[PDB]
Amino acid sequence: RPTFYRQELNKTIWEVPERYQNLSPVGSAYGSVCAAFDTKTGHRVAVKKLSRPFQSIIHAKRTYRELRLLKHMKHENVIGLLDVFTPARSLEEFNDVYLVTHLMGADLNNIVKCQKLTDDHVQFLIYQILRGLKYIHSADIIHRDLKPSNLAVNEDCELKILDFGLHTDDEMTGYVATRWYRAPEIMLNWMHYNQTVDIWSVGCIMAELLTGRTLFPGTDHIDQLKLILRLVGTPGAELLKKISSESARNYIQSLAQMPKMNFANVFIGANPLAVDLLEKMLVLDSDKRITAAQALAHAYFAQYHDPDDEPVADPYDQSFESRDLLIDEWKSLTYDEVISFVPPP
Ligand SMILES: C1CCN(C[C@H]2COC3(CCCCC3)O2)CC1
Ligand SMILES: [Cl-]
Ligand SMILES: [Cl-]
Ligand SMILES: [Cl-]
Ligand SMILES: [Cl-]
Numbered sequence: 001r002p003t004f005y006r007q008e009l010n011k012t013i014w015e016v017p018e019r020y021q022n023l024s025p026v027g028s029a030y031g032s033v034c035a036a037f038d039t040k041t042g043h044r045v046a047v048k049k050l051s052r053p054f055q056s057i058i059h060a061k062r063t064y065r066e067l068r069l070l071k072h073m074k075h076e077n078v079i080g081l082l083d084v085f086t087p088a089r090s091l092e093e094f095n096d097v098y099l100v101t102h103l104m105g106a107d108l109n110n111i112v113k114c115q116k117l118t119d120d121h122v123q124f125l126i127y128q129i130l131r132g133l134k135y136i137h138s139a140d141i142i143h144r145d146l147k148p149s150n151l152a153v154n155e156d157c158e159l160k161i162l163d164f165g166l167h168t169d170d171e172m173t174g175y176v177a178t179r180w181y182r183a184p185e186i187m188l189n190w191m192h193y194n195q196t197v198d199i200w201s202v203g204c205i206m207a208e209l210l211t212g213r214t215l216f217p218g219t220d221h222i223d224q225l226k227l228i229l230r231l232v233g234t235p236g237a238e239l240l241k242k243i244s245s246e247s248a249r250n251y252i253q254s255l256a257q258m259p260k261m262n263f264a265n266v267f268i269g270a271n272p273l274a275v276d277l278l279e280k281m282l283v284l285d286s287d288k289r290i291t292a293a294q295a296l297a298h299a300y301f302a303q304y305h306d307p308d309d310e311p312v313a314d315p316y317d318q319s320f321e322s323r324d325l326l327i328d329e330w331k332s333l334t335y336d337e338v339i340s341f342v343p344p345p
């Protein structure tokens, strides 16, 4: 067991192993984050102290869920776990959880907002998102919250996916980027959704990289749906059959019918191969959207595609999600996962 030291930073007590030095507050409802230098590995890191991890059954289960998922992710284009620790010496005194990851600088917002992106840059950035998603989806995990602020990028244009969906009603209301990248079937709860909700998000992000503008910046759920249907057309009977809410089907049928637009007249001047790929991602019927593995083999990525270097994940057991436990049982499971952690090479 390492030696810990305590300190108060911005009205919060931080007790961490000596290896972590020069802690500097950088952000704060799921927890507080400090930047630090990890003397063991030489990396600058983010250290997150979880806020009230075991205050309710819901919170204790969410803590366990986040820890299991971060321990599993081992891929160049996905954020991984460098360390996890508690200053507790026993389950009896266990109350605080700290998570350690690589410190991320820019996100994709800083890139698209204030940079000139060639088509070659768009190819490489979207390639890396799809490479990470093929890995994530192979474990039957759905990200659910892909958007530019959840994509870290460095000076060499290398990309990592972070901030897995693990949101409230108010946070999705109005003119907010938190909803602009969501597939319509989950935005309006049309049906039980698949992993291709993430592919819809990738299409929205690719369109924005190519044009410098948000694809579907709706002022509310209904305004955003209208923008979406103007581009991809209104649903045919085949998809309407798959929508569960009779009220939702009723609402859809009240709209005048519209054909799919010509994407070459929307994304003027774009690489024709990029246009072709967007038409395969931005399909209203989620059964018919291209998958991550299929998209990697698309001719738009011929420069980067290497089928011997696009790995899949080890199997991921999520049976706990249907389990009904007490706070102290979720807490004990989390404790076991903290003490069994093995750091990467
Ligand atoms: C590339 C730059 C981003 N979009 C902007 C969006 C906003 O409303 C719509 C949605 C798509 C169907 C047309 C209307 O365009 C235009 C071209
Ligand atoms: Cl990482
Ligand atoms: Cl503790
Ligand atoms: Cl964003
Ligand atoms: Cl990175």
Ligand SMILES: [Cl-]
Pocket (backbone or CB within 6 Å): 189, 190, 191, 192, 244, 245
């Ligand atoms: Cl439903």
Ligand SMILES: [Cl-]
Pocket (backbone or CB within 6 Å): 260, 261, 262, 263, 265
């Ligand atoms: Cl058109």
Ligand SMILES: [Cl-]
Pocket (backbone or CB within 6 Å): 315, 316, 317, 318
């Ligand atoms: Cl597992």
Ligand SMILES: [Mg+2]
Pocket (backbone or CB within 6 Å): 149, 150, 163
């Ligand atoms: Mg985020």
